[PDB]
């Protein structure tokens, strides 16, 4: 009997449950943050409290946890007892994978449902349905944090790295502004080839610069360009400054101006040529950002400006 | 002209999609259109803007929720110590006193949520979990009576934290549960407030949190994950408690959080290229006082002596004009429903935006009517600074527990 079925009956009116006494919740004589539960919720949870207090490891209790979960999927106590019953009753865990698939489709932002799926995958040692299932959830919400966490967990645990850069490329074509996908790109590359390989780094910086030319005001591409070069220091790449200054007239943005200040910061901290000239250009860009191009971050750019004067003068 | 969000030049901060439409730019433009209708409403109706925090409406909503809720809150039946914390904290921010009988009633309910083996569950008889444990201890410290402090079984709380500690430094959220940066913050928060930190309880924890800082500068829930404001708050606040902030690259973290403030809306987004949301007024803006304190400890001479490194005025205008429900309570953004979670964090973020403090320097920015000024909040614990000192002073008079 489904919880939403038109012929659903309360547990207190079910013949197969007549032997057990419901156990009411003890909220105290002067209750606080008291939820006026509906009859359906109160009935399920009074009977769940009864099977849990006596540790009844039965088939009826297993079916009851399904109803308790549908009423409040965040009740981690019910999820724990469901896993105890899955193992004690030797329940077919592939039937449980079908069930968890359906409830994650309904409540993809709940934590407990995703943790339950990982336990099932660990128990069965079978990740064969995971990448396709997660791609279906990401097809509905491409930035679901739990879905990306589950995807990273499956890929790391079972070594499923071979097709992920291709999947990343597909979602970047769909939405080049999806920051979760730019994160997945870094996750795949840093755990497979790494960024120390010059051919890989060159390919990544050339790809990112082409995405910046196409959509100049997309912050994720600018953040990815900075993140993969900041490790060794932006001043380590001398052609980068002039290549961004060449894109400045037609594809300008406060992201390009901020990246120029980031380059000048590292040049000053690494004993660059024309040190007096570099500091003045950096302070001028901090002023333009604080007073005009990026006033929401005026306190940040004023701090950077004072910081540069303090360190390099 | 005094309101930054209403000036003519502010129109230039609207999204530039570069003539390339994706789901992200379409949803961002929909929100900016809705936010601009709110900003222009005073001009269209021909009224002087008057940013008023609806204290009495928020107060009625909170004092009622503190006692009883409809079946619409059934999804919060495993988060009842969170409801205690969100409501009591909003009431303390609004300078509303807790009657002694109500305070006693909360102490007794949180006693029913406490597990015989330590920690608190989401309700009476529920298994313990670090999230309601964090909320119950913060709620009991907001009450701050001898009765409230006495509720906490410190010996069993310490044993419980050890049962969740992992060899790699992380903590499980609950037994047979999972790890994330929130669990390290929950444990460090309750263990420091109650004085149960042993020499090896947080061994490796700072180093594990540092592994969660990624290429963006912010912190993810676990290593490899996208930078997220809530997890970044948890990460940095846990490191401030442990005095290990320098395990992070504080400059890439400073650049990441300052970038999360929306140039047009004034509020904060939780992740890069996502929508503005009132709750991140605390998770994201709360990071600037923590970063200011961390850099000040290193003797940074370039720090401001009057303001946080975020647009305090624009954040207050977003909260006051776009996040208040007319019937009371606060929200994510216009068109969304009110809840006690957003009431807590919109008001906590508003309080950080109003009060600056560093060393002997104090400076307030109260947008709108002077009555909008809230009581201060501690950026590490998100409870009143007075309540932090009272709780730490109380529990420092007890020894750190031994092992059974
Ligand atoms: C609301 C709501 N609606 N439902 C249906 C439920 C179950 C809830 C609820 O109980 N919540 C919301 C999620 N947070 C997750 C969380 N734990 C934390 C512990 C310490 C500090 C912060 C924490 N954060 C927030 C983030 C860091 C993720 C931003 C716990 C409280
Ligand atoms: Mg769980
Ligand atoms: Zn929110």
What gap in Å lies between CA B308 and CA B298, rounded to an integer? 17
Question: Closest partner residue to A76 among B127, B226, B271, by Cβ?
Answer: B127
Based on the residue annotation, tell me whether A109 is a catalytic residue of this protein: yes
Q: Does A215 touch chain B (CB under 8 A)?
A: yes
The upper half-sphere exposure of residue A181, i.e. CA atoms within 13 Å in the direction of its Cβ, equals 22
Question: Considering only alpha carbons, which residue of chain A is nearest residue B64?
Answer: A33
Q: Which of B8, B17, B24 to mutate to test the interface with A (most CBs of A within 10 A)?
A: B24
Task: Please report, to the nearest 10 degrees, the dihedral formed by the alpha carbons of residues A114, A117, A122, A123 taken in order.
Answer: 150
Mutation for testing the A interface, residue in B5, B78, B257 having most A CBs under 10 Å: B78
> For residue B326, what are the domain limits?
1-404
Give the H or E element holding residue B69: strand B68-69
B271 is known as an active-site residue: yes
For residue B388, CA distances in Å to A21, B19, B86, B139, B140 come to 45, 51, 16, 11, 11
Cα–Cα distance, A208 to A237 (Å, whole number): 15
Of B13, B17, B221, the CB nearest to A149: B221
Check CB contact under 8 Å for B77 and A223: no
Query: How many domains is chain B built from?
Result: 1
Q: Which residues contact B54 (CB under 8 A, 6 or more apart)?
A: B324, B326, B328
Inter-axis angle of helices A93-106 and A59-71, nearest 10: 10
| DSSP bridge partners of B179 | B172
CB B154 within 8 Å of CB B140: no
Please tell me which residue in B279, B322, B323, B346 is annotated as part of the active site: B279
What is the distance between the alpha carbons of residues A89 and A49, in angstroms, rounded to a whole number?
Answer: 19
What was the experiment behind these coordinates? X-ray
Cβ pair B305, B361 in contact under 8 A: yes
- Which residues sit opposite A34 in a β-bridge? B68
- Lookup: tokens for B375: 């009581």
Between CA B54 and CA A64 the distance in angstroms is 44
Residues in chain B after which the backbone breaks (C–N beyond 2.5 Å): none
The CA distance from A51 to A72, in Å, is 17
| Beta strands at A34-35 and B68-69: parallel, antiparallel or unpaired | parallel
A18 DSSP assignment: T
Q: Which residues have CB under 8 Å from A87's CB, separation 6+?
A: none
DSSP 8-class letter at A268 = H
> Can you tell me the distance from the alpha carbon of B301 to that of B289, in angstroms, rounded to the nearest whole number?
16
Report helix angle A219-229 to A198-214, nearest 10.
160
Alpha-carbon distance of B323 to B89, in angstroms, equals 18
3-class SS string, A87-134: HHCCCCHHHHHHHHHHHHHHCCCCHHHHHHHHHHHHHHCCCCCHHHHH
Those residues with Cβ within 8 angstroms of residue B133's Cβ, 6 or more apart along the chain or in another chain: B81, B119, B120, B157, B160, B186, B190
Pairing of strands B355-358, A34-35: unpaired
Q: Minimal Cα–Cα distance from A226 to chain B, Å?
A: 8
**A38 interfacial to chain B (CB closer than 8 Å):** yes
| A180, A150 Cβ separation under 8 angstroms | no
Is residue A259 within 8 angstroms of chain B, CB to CB? no
Are B241 and B205 in contact by the 8 Å Cβ rule? The answer is no
Show me where the domains of chain A are located.
1-313
């Amino acid at each position: 009997l489904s919880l939403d079925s038109p012929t659903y009956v309360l547990y207190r009116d079910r013949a197969e449950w007549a032997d057990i006494d419901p156990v009411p919740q003890n909220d105290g004589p002067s209750p606080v943050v008291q939820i006026i539960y509906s009859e359906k919720f109160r009935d399920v949870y009074d009977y769940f409290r009864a099977v849990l207090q006596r540790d009844e490891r039965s088939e009826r209790a297993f079916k009851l946890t399904r109803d308790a979960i549908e009423l409040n999927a965040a009740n981690y106590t019910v999820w724990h007892f469901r896993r105890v019953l899955l193992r004690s009753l030797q329940k077919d865990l592939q039937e449980e994978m079908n069930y968890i698939t359906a409830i994650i489709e309904e409540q993809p932002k709940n934590y407990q449902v995703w943790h339950h799926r990982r336990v099932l995958v660990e128990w069965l040692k079978d990740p064969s349905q995971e990448l396709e299932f997660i791609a279906d959830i990401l097809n509905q919400d491409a930035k679901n944090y739990h879905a990306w966490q589950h995807r990273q967990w499956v890929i790391q645990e079972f070594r499923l790295w071979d097709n992920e850069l291709q999947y990343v490329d597909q979602l970047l074509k769909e939405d080049v502004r999806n920051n979760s996908v730019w994160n997945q790109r870094h996750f795949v590359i840093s755990n497979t080839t790494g960024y120390s390989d010059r051919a890989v780094l060159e390919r990544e910086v050339q790809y990112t610069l082409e995405m910046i030319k196409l959509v100049p005001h997309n912050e994720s591409a600018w953040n990815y360009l900075k993140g993969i070069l900041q490790d060794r220091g932006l001043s380590r790449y001398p052609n980068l400054l002039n290549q961004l200054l060449d894109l400045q007239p037609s594809h300008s943005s406060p992201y390009l101006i901020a990246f120029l200040v980031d380059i000048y910061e590292d040049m000053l901290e690494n004993q660059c040529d024309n040190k007096e000239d570099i500091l003045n250009k950096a302070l001028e860009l901090c002023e333009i950002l604080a007073k005009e191009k990026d006033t929401i971050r005026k306190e940040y750019w004023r701090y950077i400006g004072r910081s540069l004067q303090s360190k390099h003068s | 002209e005094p309101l930054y969000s209403l000036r003519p030049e502010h129109a230039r901060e609207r999204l530039q999609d570069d003539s390339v439409e994706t789901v992200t730019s379409i949803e961002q433009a929909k929100v900016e259109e809705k936010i601009q209708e709110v900003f222009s409403s005073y001009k269209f109706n021909h009224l002087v803007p008057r940013l008023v925090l609806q204290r009495e409406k928020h107060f009625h909503y909170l004092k009622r929720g503190l006692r009883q809720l409809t079946d619409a809150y059934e999804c919060l039946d495993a988060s009842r110590p969170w409801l205690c914390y969100w409501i009591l904290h909003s009431l303390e921010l609004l300078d509303e006193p807790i009657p002694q009988i109500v305070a006693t009633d909360v102490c007794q309910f949180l006693e029913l949520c406490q597990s015989p083996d330590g920690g608190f569950g989401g309700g009476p008889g529920q298994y313990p979990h670090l999230a309601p444990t964090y909320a119950a201890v913060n709620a009991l410290c907001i009450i701050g009576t001898e009765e409230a402090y006495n509720v906490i079984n410190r010996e069993k709380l310490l044993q419980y934290l050890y049962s969740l500690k992992q060899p790699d430094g992380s903590f499980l959220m609950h037994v047979g549960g999972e790890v994330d940066v929130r669990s390290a913050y929950c444990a460090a928060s309750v263990a420091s407030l109650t004085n149960i930190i042993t020499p090896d309880l947080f061994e490796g924890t700072a180093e594990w949190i540092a592994r969660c800082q990624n290429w963006e500068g912010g912190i993810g829930g676990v290593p490899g994950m996208e930078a997220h404001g809530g997890y970044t708050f948890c990460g940095l606040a846990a490191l401030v408690i442990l005095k290990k902030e320098r395990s992070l690259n504080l400059k890439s973290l400073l650049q990441w959080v300052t970038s999360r403030q929306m140039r047009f809306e004034g509020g904060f987004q939780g992740r890069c290229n996502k929508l503005v949301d009132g709750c991140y007024s605390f998770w994201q803006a709360g990071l600037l006082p923590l970063l200011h304190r961390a850099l000040h400890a290193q003797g940074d001479p370039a720090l401001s002596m009057s303001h946080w490194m975020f647009h305090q005025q624009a954040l207050q205008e977003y909260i006051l004009m776009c996040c208040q429900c007319p019937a009371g309570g606060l929200l994510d953004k216009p068109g969304k429903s009110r809840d006690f979670y957003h009431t807590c964090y919109c008001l906590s973020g508003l309080s950080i935006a109003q009060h600056f403090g560093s060393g002997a320097m104090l400076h307030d920015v109260v947008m709108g009517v002077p009555e909008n000024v809230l009581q201060p909040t501690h950026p590490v614990y998100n409870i009143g600074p007075d309540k932090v000192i009272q709780a730490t002073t109380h529990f420092l008079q007890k020894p750190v527990p031994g092992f059974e």
